[PDB]
Subunit: 299 residues, 2 copies
């Protein structure tokens, strides 16, 4: 079988707290004795249009921040700002702190999102960093400070903190150093992203997944060069395929005995013709939010 | 705009253990001082075609069961069989036991699965119980004893425990009282699922979701009786609606002001005429794995 699969979220659930300043409430991440959260918690409705965050922060005291782990209030003993992330030092360490790292992911890479409201986890799902640095998430009011992450041998790699929604319904945020992915800004304005593209290496991974699970109507006897595939890919606003990408697909190629460039020839035919009403793994659309690693692990 | 979202898995992660007999290891669920697992952990390969579980259990003693949380052994102090589940009394009450219930779900209901191997969680995903009492999971060897669950106001409702795969690649299992969903048995014999059908109540939920988001071209000014709709539905391999289905659509019907039987009339028209090249929620296919509760959550 094959489904979109998220990492188990327990290690991150143990770190989620509620952070309140004024009449603004969102989520924070409690690691050791520090709570990380979006800096726009310090804004008011009038501030959010063109906020001078340095000015706004100097006017705040430690006692203006209300941090709550469940029913328990945590005392803020210091605060600083790192790009778009506020760091609140608290006097108690989180015993539930996992082994962790802060990473900045590359477009095309996937991660799990733990969506939280008022410091309480609500759901978990798998996202990809779009090539235009948006993410197609499910985030409502109060979700800010929800984080995205991957897990590797009990170590949690935090890669995303949520900040905003765009008019098209996609989302934008930062890494845990507070730098936005993409050309976005934490001000209350309608922002557009650059033109998105489809993550080609992931579509190929997913086609290999469809084959591993016995779905093959789209395979063909033809083949293609890497450059000629990339010309057609770019015409249809697919990302070009690098030789690193070809190499990353090897294990799936071997597992199925289908050369990478043969699968490229199949994808080319789908782009040029369509799916003729047929479906792949249930979908009427080509899916590009499974990486090669994702497919392997689950297969 | 909608995606499969799982419940945060942490409360369930804290209950997963491994249960071994000889070299056969699967997963178990540790709640208070009882571990629940599939009874076929007591089978050798020779026993699995036509096991005499009652006879196999008589030869078992407490000291034959290796239960481990991680690498830490949990001593077994009693054992009993309840239908297709083994219950192992252990000498330690699980300190991470959540508030919980055992529930038996209906076809069409959705739940999160925490896929586990050797007592270690690998991933979490959302499943729907199909009308033929199979699920389309992602399960590998050693996944038995993985559980499906819903979470309501901090209470975990356990509804599924995994036991087997069917030739078509779908999966079958029991509730936590050990009664299989569907006509299946825990024997290593070839078994067939009934022909599957589309989950009508979930398609209706999906149409309500489309209306909530402003996509409502398919609404018409007609209605139908429940019986007339059910008789048409069956001719298109749609599940007939129950009174419980009508009731769980209540909130969405209230939210939109569209009576359930009016929406049924719109669906009937879609079934009899097709989509005429149009889309709903950006899809030419009707989705049937989002329940009325799922829709409310994400909307």
């Amino acid at each position: 079988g094959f489904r979109k699969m998220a990492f188990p979220s327990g290690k991150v659930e143990g770190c989620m707290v509620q952070v309140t300043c004024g009449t603004t409430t969102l989520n924070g991440l409690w690691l050791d004795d520090v709570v990380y959260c979006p800096r726009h918690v310090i804004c008011t409705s009038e501030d959010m249009l063109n906020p001078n965050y340095e000015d706004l922060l100097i006017r705040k005291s430690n006692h203006n921040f209300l941090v709550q782990a469940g029913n328990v209030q945590l005392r803020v003993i210091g605060h600083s700002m790192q790009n778009c992330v506020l760091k609140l030092k608290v006097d108690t360490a989180n015993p539930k702190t996992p082994k962790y790292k802060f990473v900045r992911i590359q477009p095309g890479q996937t991660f799990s999102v733990l969506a939280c409201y008022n410091g309480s986890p609500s759901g978990v799902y798998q996202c990809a960093m779009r090539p235009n640095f948006t993410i197609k998430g499910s985030f409502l009011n109060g979700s800010c400070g929800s984080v995205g992450f991957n897990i590797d041998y009990d170590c949690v790699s935090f890669c995303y903190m949520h900040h905003m929604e765009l008019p098209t319904g996609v989302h934008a945020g930062t890494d845990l150093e507070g730098n936005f992915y993409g050309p976005f800004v934490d001000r209350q304005t309608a922002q557009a992203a650059g033109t998105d593209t489809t993550i080609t290496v992931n579509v190929l991974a997913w086609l290999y997944a469809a084959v591993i699970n016995g779905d093959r109507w789209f395979l063909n006897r033809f083949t293609t060069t890497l450059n000629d595939f990339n010309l057609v890919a770019m015409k249809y606003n697919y990302e070009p395929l690098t030789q690193d990408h070809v190499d990353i697909l090897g294990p799936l190629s071997a597992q199925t005995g289908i050369a990478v460039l043969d699968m490229c020839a199949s994808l080319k035919e789908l782009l040029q013709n369509g799916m003729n009403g047929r479906t792949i793994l249930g979908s009427a659309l080509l899916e590009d939010e499974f990486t090669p690693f994702d497919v392997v692990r689950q297969c």
